[PDB]
Design a binder for these strands. Sequence first.
RNA 1: CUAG
Length: 174
Amino acid sequence: PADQTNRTSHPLPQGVNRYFVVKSNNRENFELSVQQGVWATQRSNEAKLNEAFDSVENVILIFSVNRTRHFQGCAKMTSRIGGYIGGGNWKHEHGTAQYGRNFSVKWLKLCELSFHKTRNLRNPYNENLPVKISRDCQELEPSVGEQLASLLYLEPDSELMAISIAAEAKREEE
RNA sequence: CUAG
């Protein structure tokens, strides 16, 4: 009874964060990311994630699979792109849009956040369009990013959350 | 990217 209420997701790190919407063409890659703690983006996006990674303590990546009408969670970018990381043999069609280098992520919160529920939120960095209209690695104006992440934390954990925590712990035993 |  001395034990604090134990938690099943990681809270949004405190401090000065930047926020990017990350898009996947398919669930398979997103699920692989969750099992392995790894992502890779399009080559053209790598310098901008590295610029964010160098600039602030936490780069928060809010994921959404194309066409699912939902956000699926948020991760912290935990390594700079460049440098061997490993994992992630990714699915893609006839070699097109071939992905860049794998980097580490830590899944903070996994859930299914409907776009309906984000419909009053717009992003000044993308012409004040609703945040659902976000290409891969579009930056969220940071006050809007913090609002969008806060909506994620209102949703119940999806089944992937515990999958993530388990995989994360397994990688920790070294 | 969102919509079909």
